[PDB]
Amino acid sequence: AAQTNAPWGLARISSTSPGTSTYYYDESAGQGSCVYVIDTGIEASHPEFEGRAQMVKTYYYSSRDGNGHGTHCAGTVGSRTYGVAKKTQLFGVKVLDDNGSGQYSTIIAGMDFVASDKNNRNCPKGVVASLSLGGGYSSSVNSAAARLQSSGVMVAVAAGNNNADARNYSPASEPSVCTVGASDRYDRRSSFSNYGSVLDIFGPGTDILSTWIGGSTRSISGTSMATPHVAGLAAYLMTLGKTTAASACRYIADTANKGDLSNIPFGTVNLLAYNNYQA
Numbered sequence: 001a002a003q004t005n006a007p008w009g010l011a012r013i014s015s016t017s018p019g020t021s022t023y024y025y026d027e028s029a030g031q032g033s034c035v036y037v038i039d040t041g042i043e044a045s046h047p048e049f050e051g052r053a054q055m056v057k058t059y060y061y062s063s064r065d066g067n068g069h070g071t072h073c074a075g076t077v078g079s080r081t082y083g084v085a086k087k088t089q090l091f092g093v094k095v096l097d098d099n100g101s102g103q104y105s106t107i108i109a110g111m112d113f114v115a116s117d118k119n120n121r122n123c124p125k126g127v128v129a130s131l132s133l134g135g136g137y138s139s140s141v142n143s144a145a146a147r148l149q150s151s152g153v154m155v156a157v158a159a160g161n162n163n164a165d166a167r168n169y170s171p172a173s174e175p176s177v178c179t180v181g182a183s184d185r186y187d188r189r190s191s192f193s194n195y196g197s198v199l200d201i202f203g204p205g206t207d208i209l210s211t212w213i214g215g216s217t218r219s220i221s222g223t224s225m226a227t228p229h230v231a232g233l234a235a236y237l238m239t240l241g242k243t244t245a246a247s248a249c250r251y252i253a254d255t256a257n258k259g260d261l262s263n264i265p266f267g268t269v270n271l272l273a274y275n276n277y278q279a
């Protein structure tokens, strides 16, 4: 399948070169997979989700996304126009309030919620979780992410936006999950992206168009935007049977575009997520 005039990041993940605008992908499109978006919620009524999104849990007075961040991330995972895996099922877990903040205890509870809740969902091709959030180092937060991964969920987490080594942030610093840095449309490391040995992969993160609340769209930047590209890619590859939740991060790194990013610090991987789709 070819989507013309796609957002640059979708085109980038199906290309050996920057500077193109068509996204190419296998029509299976993540059908039969599920992606949890652990964030501020998802506006499931957005036409771009086509009925494939739903809120499954909130820790606040509403499950609605009163912020936009979670809706934007969910759109990059799986919206019809802005998403990597255009036929995946999207499940929202609202651990962040409408200002984008949340207590670590609530985030940990949300991760353990997903590890159990997947057993209440039909995801025969596999389960992914996208965590576009983070803070300072916490062994407890890292352990929660490691439990979620161990339970059979491909966990992708944002590296953070501090232009610093991600070893001092959680869940970015947890070794067993997939820690995602951000790049721009010219294959430069995004100016804010964290780096370091704990990164596994880069994805598009600067100027990413996706869904927003009120049935709208907008372009924003962050490692929060790169993370759902990798989450959606994992769902897409698991549906194709190319990898599993336990091995998908390693598979994405093994099949990535290598050595093509600029301003990558010595000791950080130079690997850009790539679907290796041959139309």
Ligand SMILES: Fc1ccc(C2=NNC3=NCCN3C2)cc1F
Pocket: 186, 187, 188
């Ligand atoms: F490696 C690079 C090569 C070209 C550019 C460019 N800056 N801005 C720009 N506007 C239209 C085309 N174009 C190329 C950036 C890079 F980082």
